[PDB]
Motif scaffolding. Structure first.
Motif, PDB file in Angstrom:
ATOM      1  N   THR A   1       0.811  -1.211   0.000  1.00 18.60           N
ATOM      2  CA  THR A   1       0.000   0.000   0.000  1.00 18.60           C
ATOM      3  C   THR A   1       0.847   1.263   0.000  1.00 18.60           C
ATOM      4  OG1 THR A   1      -0.154  -0.036   2.419  1.00 18.60           O
ATOM      5  CG2 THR A   1      -1.883  -1.173   1.179  1.00 18.60           C
ATOM      6  N   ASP A   2       2.078   1.197   0.507  1.00 17.78           N
ATOM      7  CA  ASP A   2       2.970   2.347   0.510  1.00 17.78           C
ATOM      8  C   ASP A   2       3.607   2.605  -0.848  1.00 17.78           C
ATOM      9  OD1 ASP A   2       2.416   2.681   3.176  1.00 17.78           O
ATOM     10  OD2 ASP A   2       4.275   1.759   3.892  1.00 17.78           O
ATOM     11  N   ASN A   3       3.754   1.573  -1.681  1.00 17.29           N
ATOM     12  CA  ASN A   3       4.326   1.729  -3.012  1.00 17.29           C
ATOM     13  C   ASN A   3       3.283   1.994  -4.089  1.00 17.29           C
ATOM     14  OD1 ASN A   3       6.925   1.299  -2.044  1.00 17.29           O
ATOM     15  ND2 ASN A   3       6.889  -0.904  -2.476  1.00 17.29           N
ATOM     16  N   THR A   4       1.996   1.907  -3.759  1.00 13.54           N
ATOM     17  CA  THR A   4       0.925   2.125  -4.719  1.00 13.54           C
ATOM     18  C   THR A   4      -0.149   3.005  -4.095  1.00 13.54           C
ATOM     19  OG1 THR A   4      -0.237   0.099  -4.054  1.00 13.54           O
ATOM     20  CG2 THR A   4       1.342  -0.075  -5.868  1.00 13.54           C
ATOM     21  N   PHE A   5      -1.039   3.512  -4.946  1.00 16.60           N
ATOM     22  CA  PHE A   5      -2.161   4.328  -4.508  1.00 16.60           C
ATOM     23  C   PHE A   5      -3.442   3.823  -5.156  1.00 16.60           C
ATOM     24  CE2 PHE A   5      -0.300   6.358  -8.207  1.00 16.60           C
ATOM     25  CZ  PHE A   5      -1.389   6.610  -9.015  1.00 16.60           C
ATOM     26  N   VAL A   6      -4.548   3.979  -4.437  1.00 20.68           N
ATOM     27  CA  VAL A   6      -5.846   3.484  -4.880  1.00 20.68           C
ATOM     28  C   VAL A   6      -6.473   4.512  -5.810  1.00 20.68           C
ATOM     29  CG1 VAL A   6      -8.141   2.755  -4.144  1.00 20.68           C
ATOM     30  CG2 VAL A   6      -6.138   2.145  -2.775  1.00 20.68           C
ATOM     31  N   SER A   7      -6.789   4.088  -7.033  1.00 21.39           N
ATOM     32  CA  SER A   7      -7.434   4.959  -8.005  1.00 21.39           C
ATOM     33  C   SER A   7      -8.435   4.149  -8.815  1.00 21.39           C
ATOM     34  CB  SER A   7      -6.404   5.608  -8.935  1.00 21.39           C
ATOM     35  OG  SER A   7      -7.039   6.406  -9.920  1.00 21.39           O
ATOM     36  N   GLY A   8      -9.632   4.704  -8.996  1.00 22.28           N
ATOM     37  CA  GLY A   8     -10.643   4.073  -9.820  1.00 22.28           C
ATOM     38  C   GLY A   8     -10.976   2.660  -9.363  1.00 22.28           C
ATOM     39  N   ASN A   9     -11.449   1.865 -10.321  1.00 20.99           N
ATOM     40  CA  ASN A   9     -11.796   0.470 -10.096  1.00 20.99           C
ATOM     41  C   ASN A   9     -11.017  -0.404 -11.071  1.00 20.99           C
ATOM     42  OD1 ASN A   9     -14.173   0.339  -8.023  1.00 20.99           O
ATOM     43  ND2 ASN A   9     -14.734   2.006  -9.419  1.00 20.99           N
ATOM     44  N   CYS A  10     -11.229  -1.715 -10.962  1.00 26.58           N
ATOM     45  CA  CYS A  10     -10.528  -2.680 -11.801  1.00 26.58           C
ATOM     46  C   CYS A  10     -11.160  -2.841 -13.178  1.00 26.58           C
ATOM     47  CB  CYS A  10     -10.477  -4.043 -11.103  1.00 26.58           C
ATOM     48  SG  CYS A  10      -9.568  -4.050  -9.540  1.00 26.58           S
ATOM     49  N   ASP A  11     -12.363  -2.311 -13.392  1.00 31.86           N
ATOM     50  CA  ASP A  11     -13.060  -2.434 -14.666  1.00 31.86           C
ATOM     51  C   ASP A  11     -12.675  -1.340 -15.655  1.00 31.86           C
ATOM     52  OD1 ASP A  11     -14.207  -0.312 -13.393  1.00 31.86           O
ATOM     53  OD2 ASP A  11     -16.286  -0.966 -13.652  1.00 31.86           O
ATOM     54  N   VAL A  12     -11.774  -0.441 -15.275  1.00 30.51           N
ATOM     55  CA  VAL A  12     -11.345   0.657 -16.136  1.00 30.51           C
ATOM     56  C   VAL A  12     -10.086   0.294 -16.912  1.00 30.51           C
ATOM     57  CG1 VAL A  12     -10.602   3.070 -16.165  1.00 30.51           C
ATOM     58  CG2 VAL A  12     -12.434   2.348 -14.621  1.00 30.51           C
ATOM     59  N   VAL A  13      -8.982   0.060 -16.204  1.00 29.22           N
ATOM     60  CA  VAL A  13      -7.706  -0.241 -16.846  1.00 29.22           C
ATOM     61  C   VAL A  13      -7.881  -1.438 -17.773  1.00 29.22           C
ATOM     62  CG1 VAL A  13      -5.305  -0.902 -16.467  1.00 29.22           C
ATOM     63  CG2 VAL A  13      -6.421   0.705 -14.907  1.00 29.22           C
ATOM     64  N   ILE A  14      -7.318  -1.341 -18.974  1.00 27.06           N
ATOM     65  CA  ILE A  14      -7.324  -2.452 -19.919  1.00 27.06           C
ATOM     66  C   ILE A  14      -6.055  -3.268 -19.705  1.00 27.06           C
ATOM     67  CG2 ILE A  14      -7.235  -3.108 -22.346  1.00 27.06           C
ATOM     68  CD1 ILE A  14      -8.895  -0.570 -22.936  1.00 27.06           C
ATOM     69  N   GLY A  15      -6.221  -4.548 -19.390  1.00 25.38           N
ATOM     70  CA  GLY A  15      -5.103  -5.425 -19.121  1.00 25.38           C
ATOM     71  C   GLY A  15      -4.705  -5.529 -17.667  1.00 25.38           C
ATOM     72  N   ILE A  16      -5.533  -5.033 -16.744  1.00 28.41           N
ATOM     73  CA  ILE A  16      -5.199  -5.100 -15.329  1.00 28.41           C
ATOM     74  C   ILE A  16      -5.069  -6.555 -14.903  1.00 28.41           C
ATOM     75  CG2 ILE A  16      -7.617  -5.047 -14.627  1.00 28.41           C
ATOM     76  CD1 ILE A  16      -6.672  -3.356 -12.191  1.00 28.41           C
ATOM     77  N   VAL A  17      -4.182  -6.804 -13.941  1.00 30.05           N
ATOM     78  CA  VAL A  17      -3.918  -8.147 -13.443  1.00 30.05           C
ATOM     79  C   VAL A  17      -4.237  -8.188 -11.955  1.00 30.05           C
ATOM     80  CG1 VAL A  17      -2.190  -8.684 -15.192  1.00 30.05           C
ATOM     81  CG2 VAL A  17      -1.480  -7.633 -13.032  1.00 30.05           C
ATOM     82  N   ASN A  18      -4.477  -9.401 -11.461  1.00 25.56           N
ATOM     83  CA  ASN A  18      -4.821  -9.615 -10.064  1.00 25.56           C
ATOM     84  C   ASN A  18      -3.604 -10.101  -9.287  1.00 25.56           C
ATOM     85  OD1 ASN A  18      -7.947  -9.313  -9.774  1.00 25.56           O
ATOM     86  ND2 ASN A  18      -7.662 -10.512 -11.651  1.00 25.56           N
ATOM     87  N   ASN A  19      -3.340  -9.452  -8.156  1.00 23.42           N
ATOM     88  CA  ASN A  19      -2.238  -9.838  -7.288  1.00 23.42           C
ATOM     89  C   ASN A  19      -2.543  -9.346  -5.880  1.00 23.42           C
ATOM     90  OD1 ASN A  19       0.257 -11.011  -6.616  1.00 23.42           O
ATOM     91  ND2 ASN A  19       1.345  -9.072  -6.923  1.00 23.42           N
ATOM     92  N   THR A  20      -1.855  -9.937  -4.908  1.00 25.99           N
ATOM     93  CA  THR A  20      -2.053  -9.600  -3.504  1.00 25.99           C
ATOM     94  C   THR A  20      -1.202  -8.385  -3.153  1.00 25.99           C
ATOM     95  OG1 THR A  20      -2.507 -11.911  -2.943  1.00 25.99           O
ATOM     96  CG2 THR A  20      -1.899 -10.430  -1.141  1.00 25.99           C
ATOM     97  N   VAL A  21      -1.852  -7.322  -2.693  1.00 24.76           N
ATOM     98  CA  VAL A  21      -1.160  -6.122  -2.237  1.00 24.76           C
ATOM     99  C   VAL A  21      -0.962  -6.241  -0.731  1.00 24.76           C
ATOM    100  CG1 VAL A  21      -1.261  -3.616  -2.030  1.00 24.76           C
ATOM    101  CG2 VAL A  21      -2.094  -4.735  -4.106  1.00 24.76           C
ATOM    102  N   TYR A  22       0.296  -6.278  -0.303  1.00 24.20           N
ATOM    103  CA  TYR A  22       0.618  -6.479   1.103  1.00 24.20           C
ATOM    104  C   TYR A  22       0.443  -5.180   1.880  1.00 24.20           C
ATOM    105  CZ  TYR A  22       3.373  -7.368   5.311  1.00 24.20           C
ATOM    106  OH  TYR A  22       3.803  -7.484   6.612  1.00 24.20           O
ATOM    107  N   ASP A  23      -0.382  -5.228   2.923  1.00 27.12           N
ATOM    108  CA  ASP A  23      -0.606  -4.078   3.791  1.00 27.12           C
ATOM    109  C   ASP A  23       0.180  -4.271   5.082  1.00 27.12           C
ATOM    110  OD1 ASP A  23      -1.457  -1.892   5.179  1.00 27.12           O
ATOM    111  OD2 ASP A  23      -3.575  -2.463   5.266  1.00 27.12           O
ATOM    112  N   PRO A  24       1.212  -3.469   5.354  1.00 31.78           N
ATOM    113  CA  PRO A  24       1.995  -3.685   6.581  1.00 31.78           C
ATOM    114  C   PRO A  24       1.228  -3.385   7.855  1.00 31.78           C
ATOM    115  CG  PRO A  24       2.676  -1.654   5.524  1.00 31.78           C
ATOM    116  CD  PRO A  24       1.702  -2.310   4.586  1.00 31.78           C
ATOM    117  N   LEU A  25       0.118  -2.649   7.775  1.00 29.66           N
ATOM    118  CA  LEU A  25      -0.642  -2.324   8.977  1.00 29.66           C
ATOM    119  C   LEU A  25      -1.450  -3.516   9.474  1.00 29.66           C
ATOM    120  CD1 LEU A  25      -1.656  -0.238  11.054  1.00 29.66           C
ATOM    121  CD2 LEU A  25      -3.410   0.410   9.397  1.00 29.66           C
TER     122      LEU A  25
END
Lengths: 32, 31
Positions: free
Chosen positions: B1-25
């Motif tokens: 979560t510190d290396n990325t930011f939340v924007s929009g949804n997954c139905d927008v980006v073309i070619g988005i992939v699914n992966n586990t985002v590690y939350d240190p909190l």
């Protein structure tokens, strides 16, 4: 708190306004 | 979560992939 940083005090800024800054850690601590 | 930011949804980006985002909190509060 992640979109802003803390610099100075409320009294020294001209034209400053009041509001409630949202802390994402609060709801996470509610469950904790 | 510190290396990325939340924007929009997954139905927008073309070619988005699914992966586990590690939350240190999460493990810090669980431990």
């Amino acid at each position: 708190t992640d979109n802003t940083f803390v610099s100075g005090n409320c009294d020294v800024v001209i034209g400053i306004v009041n509001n409630t800054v949202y802390d994402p850690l609060q709801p996470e601590l509610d469950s904790f």
